[PDB]
């Protein structure tokens, strides 16, 4: 279920691009927690 | 009567003028009221309007630089500061369209009067575009022809190369985001 | 019997008592019922000149009140009749050649056709907004159900801020309205490919379909990341940040 | 059957001689000359001339019988009217004419200004000039909208003489602002570089704000215009100016500047002040509103230089300022008083902070 | 031609309201015609003046019995 | 035949009148529908009007600086005095105009009746005129010229002297107070 414009979470992935701020942020605790 | 005109405009080619841009707006001489007026009349609205067709079709290429071109997101981003700029351009077609609604007997060149200011604007924007990408300089090697052309004396030129200009720092500044 | 008043055309050409009746005056200065006769009659003029080869594009008499209220069918992304799902449609086609307030239909009726377009994406988009829940028996996981539920509940967002209009607007405003959401309906329905009746593109390029499985959401997430701010790309990114959460119910 | 048709107006109107003015000198010609053929003048009604005269003072490319030939405005002589005689006719045709030649020129100029570096700059001067001329026609043709408005009530009407009352500060300035443009434009030659074009421009510019200064005291309207011109004109050299003396230098080296701009000299030059700092020909395309300012303008774009070298509203702002607080006489008031005032300040502060 | 007749009835009776006005007659516009074009069917010119007189010094004594 | 007797006063010549050059405002004699003592009346009339083609080509001439004539200020100012005491020329023949278009049956003896004033305060101004360009005077020399005939008779010429009067010595007190 997505929303309107919803230009928050749009930006987010958009000026930093989609997977920049994936990697920055899930993909970085992705490989943390699959370390641990 | 307009409304073709408008729709050319909008880009629904009219009948007399067929917009296809390769054509331009190839004015039919089927004219009513057929004096030079009205042919006049026409042919500059056929200025503005094979220029927004050429503009529009630019966009919808610009929907665009990251290929074989001059490679760069920042195409989008000057097709997003063009549409901007046109932005004023369409809600004035829109208050034209309302307008001519309203007179009955339609002010057809007191409206191009009133619009003559974005249809000469166009032919300069339509000129720094032309130089930024015909030239294909990629990245902001084809922003360079606005950057450097801030010794531009068209003000309206000058507003929507300003459009672009805010469009390119908020793109620099995303770039050294990212590069910092 | 006194109350009458007088015309103030005074004419130094007419002599006597003038009435001033204009020359049936320049259609570019007043039409939308006489550029309606002007028009079509150049159309016919084609037409003639070509062999009566409209049929269906012989001005379609629309009301602007009935091109308002077929554009507020397909603002629900519905087929209207000009804008109905036709065999070789799956979405959008137009009737037979709208005319245009004092136009024959060739301009009209191609501005109907570009808002047409537009109308026929939001039919095969909305069709494919219900990915999710439509691929109930679905062996592609989580990721069409998170993205076309997504997709789903987005285009009721859309279709909130469709409906809040009044279905009087003008068409080329209301298209002008939707044409950042054209770009985004044009960038999302490129990688559906929506098309029902007649089945390929939904909107955006020739679309035969959307990527599969989570590698559907392997393409979605690259794309994402290069197509971002846009009408689709910020929309797909807020999307994707969105089914984020769903990975992280798939973490 | 008209202009807009490909046939004469063929039409009645109140009979007799009163409304039959061509018919009543045809008759005269027909009468007094069984011979006398009248020559078959298209006849046009006076208020369908008059709708075409609104579209041609908005600027309409030609009528069927008022084509602009050469350039200039012309009209077909196989035209006539009923409510009126060929010479009376073609005398209001040649009122209307003159201003219509004069603004077939205008425009063609304006059009050809409008044409429809990076460390240069293009001819900021032509630039500014068709933004002025913009301006301008931009009036003009509001006038003619105006008009339209008026033709498009259809129930009221005005003499071309009310047309060219309304039109009183405009065709002044028509014929006073050719003539200037005359001097501007071609006293700047083609040969003359974009420096040499700019300096002459410039120096019929002020020459005619001191002409028009005495061509009429109430001209403040067409002197007004030839003023915001002038303003215009100077917004090129007053931001060359004022990147000369902010940044010593900028993205913009139009070389549209009668100064000598031998940029050959490196910035860490002592020959910099002199080369780049000159006075540039077509001592050069020098005037004594700035040649007396020279001085401290070569002395004060040095130190700007220097300035920047060193750490390696704006002059235009402010000189709007003081235009609006000027804005018979001539460019002499304003002008000297910005330049002691405003550009005293600027001179003296520039150097004293490069130094 | 009843347009013709409209206006021309227009222009006589902005005559006639110039006329009364230079005469300053006190007269109303509400006998802008009926007082004219009752008379017309061949009223005494003589006897409707004299009913006229008579009707506004009754009225000028109605106005005074009511002030 | 009002209508274009009028333009050809109004300082554009018709066909039965020609604007002879040195034969001044004269008139193609082989027209019906008058007696030639109206046309003798239209004479008088011409007169004045041949008088305006003049002042016409003269204030045009003194409204173009290097050449011998008389110059200064005081020439352009002398014209646009004489084209402002013309407004009201201009207004009462533009007001006249409208009357006889107004009017079913407007006699040119009205016309008359009505451009009488005019006429009367017309041929005392051009004959100071004719003076002045025989005295061929500059500098404040016109300026006392001025002020020899602005002790005039004619009421209407008297108060047209007044005010063009008022306008010289204005910049004459603009010259002084540059001086001060």
Not at chain 3, 210 to 233: I, K
Request: hydrophobic residues 40%; contains cysteine.
């Amino acid at each position: 279920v997505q929303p309107d414009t919803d230009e928050t979470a749009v930006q987010l992935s958009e000026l930093l691009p989609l997977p920049v701020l994936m990697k920055h942020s899930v993909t970085a605790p992705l490989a943390a927690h699959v370390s641990l | 009567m307009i409304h073709e005109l408008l729709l050319a405009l909008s880009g629904y080619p009219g009948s007399i003028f067929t917009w296809n841009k390769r054509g331009g707006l190839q004015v039919s001489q089927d004219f009513p009221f057929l004096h030079p007026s009205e042919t006049s009349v026409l042919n500059r609205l056929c200025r503005l309007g094979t220029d927004y067709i050429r503009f529009t079709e630019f966009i919808e290429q610009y929907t665009q630089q990251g290929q074989g071109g001059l490679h760069g997101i920042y195409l989008r981003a000057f097709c997003t500061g063009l549409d901007s700029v046109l932005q004023p351009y369409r809600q004035a077609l829109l208050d034209l369209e309302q307008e001519f609604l309203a007179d009955p007997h339609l002010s057809i060149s007191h409206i191009n009067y009133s619009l003559d200011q974005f249809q000469l604007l166009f032919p300069s924007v339509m000129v720094v575009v032309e130089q930024i990408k015909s030239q294909k300089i990629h990245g902001c090697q084809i922003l360079e022809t606005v950057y450097k052309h801030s010794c531009g004396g068209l003000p309206p030129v000058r507003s929507a190369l300003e459009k672009i200009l805010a469009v390119c720092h908020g793109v620099m500044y995303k770039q050294l985001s990212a590069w910092m | 019997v006194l109350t009458y008043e007088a015309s103030r055309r005074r004419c130094w050409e007419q002599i006597g008592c003038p009435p001033g009746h204009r020359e049936e005056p320049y259609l570019t200065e007043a039409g939308r019922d006489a550029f309606d006769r002007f028009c079509r009659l150049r159309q016919g003029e084609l037409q003639v000149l070509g062999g009566a080869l409209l049929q269906a594009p012989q001005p379609v008499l629309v009301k602007e009140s009935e091109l308002v209220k077929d554009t507020l069918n397909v603002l629900l992304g519905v087929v209207s009749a000009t804008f109905s799902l036709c065999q070789p449609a799956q979405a959008f086609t137009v009737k037979r050649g709208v005319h245009v307030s004092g136009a024959s239909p060739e301009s009209v009726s191609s501005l109907l056709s570009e808002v047409a377009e537009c109308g026929t994406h939001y039919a095969r988009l909305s069709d494919f907004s219900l990915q999710p829940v439509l691929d109930s028996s679905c062996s592609k996981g989580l990721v069409f159900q998170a993205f076309t539920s997504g997709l789903r509940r987005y285009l009721q967002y859309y279709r909130a801020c469709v409906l809040s209009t009044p279905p009087t607007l003008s068409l080329l405003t209301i298209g002008f309205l939707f044409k950042k959401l054209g770009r985004q309906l044009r960038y999302l329905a490129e990688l559906c490919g929506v098309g029902t009746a007649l089945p390929g593109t939904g909107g955006g390029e020739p679309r035969a379909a959307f990527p599969t499985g989570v590698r559907l959401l392997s393409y979605l997430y690259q794309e994402a990341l290069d197509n971002c701010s846009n009408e689709h790309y910020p929309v797909l990114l807020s999307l994707l940040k969105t089914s984020c959460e769903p990975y992280t119910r798939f973490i | 059957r008209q202009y807009w048709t490909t046939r004469s107006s063929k039409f009645p109107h109140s009979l007799h001689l009163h409304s039959n003015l061509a018919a009543v000198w045809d008759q005269h010609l027909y009468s007094s000359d069984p011979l006398y053929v009248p020559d078959d003048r298209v006849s046009v009604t006076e208020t369908q001339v008059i709708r075409e005269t609104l579209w041609l003072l908005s600027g309409v490319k030609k009528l069927f019988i008022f084509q602009l030939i050469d350039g200039k405005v012309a009209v077909r002589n196989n035209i006539m009217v009923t409510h009126l005689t060929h010479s009376c006719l073609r005398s209001v045709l040649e009122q209307i004419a003159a201003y219509g030649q004069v603004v077939f020129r205008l425009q063609e100029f304006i059009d050809e200004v409008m044409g429809h570096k990076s460390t240069d700059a293009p001819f900021r001067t032509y630039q500014a000039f068709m933004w002025a001329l913009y301006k301008y026609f931009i009036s003009f043709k509001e006038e003619l909208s105006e008009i339209e408005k008026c033709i498009i009530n259809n129930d009221t009407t005005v003499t071309l003489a009310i047309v060219v009352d309304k039109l009183s500060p405009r065709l002044a300035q028509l014929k006073v602002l050719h003539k200037v443009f005359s001097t501007g434009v071609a006293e700047v030659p083609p040969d003359t570089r974009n420096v040499v074009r700019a300096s002459h421009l410039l120096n019929t510019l002020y020459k005619a704000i001191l002409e028009y200064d005495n061509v009429g005291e109430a001209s403040e309207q067409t002197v007004s215009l030839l003023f915001s011109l002038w303003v215009e004109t100077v917004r090129p050299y007053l931001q060359i100016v004022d990147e000369w003396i902010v940044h010593g230098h900028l993205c913009d080296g139009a070389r549209e500047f009668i100064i000598q701009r031998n940029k050959n000299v490196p910035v860490n030059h002592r020959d910099f002040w002199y080369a780049t700092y000159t006075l540039y020909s077509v001592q050069h395309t020098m005037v004594s509103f700035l040649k007396p300012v020279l001085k401290q303008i070569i002395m004060a774009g040095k130190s700007m230089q220097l300035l920047k070298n060193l750490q390696c509203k704006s002059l235009y702002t402010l000189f709007l300022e003081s235009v609006q607080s000027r804005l018979c006489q001539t460019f002499e008031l304003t002008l000297r008083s910005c330049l002691y005032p405003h550009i005293d300040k600027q001179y003296l502060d520039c150097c004293g902070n490069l130094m | 031609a009843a347009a013709a007749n409209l206006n021309a009835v227009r222009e006589t009776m902005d005559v006639l309201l110039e006329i009364s006005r230079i005469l300053n007659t006190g007269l109303d516009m509400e006998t802008l015609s009926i007082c004219v074009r009752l008379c017309e069917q061949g009223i005494n010119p003589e006897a409707l003046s004299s009913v006229i007189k008579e009707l506004r010094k009754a009225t000028e004594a109605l106005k005074a019995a009511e002030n």
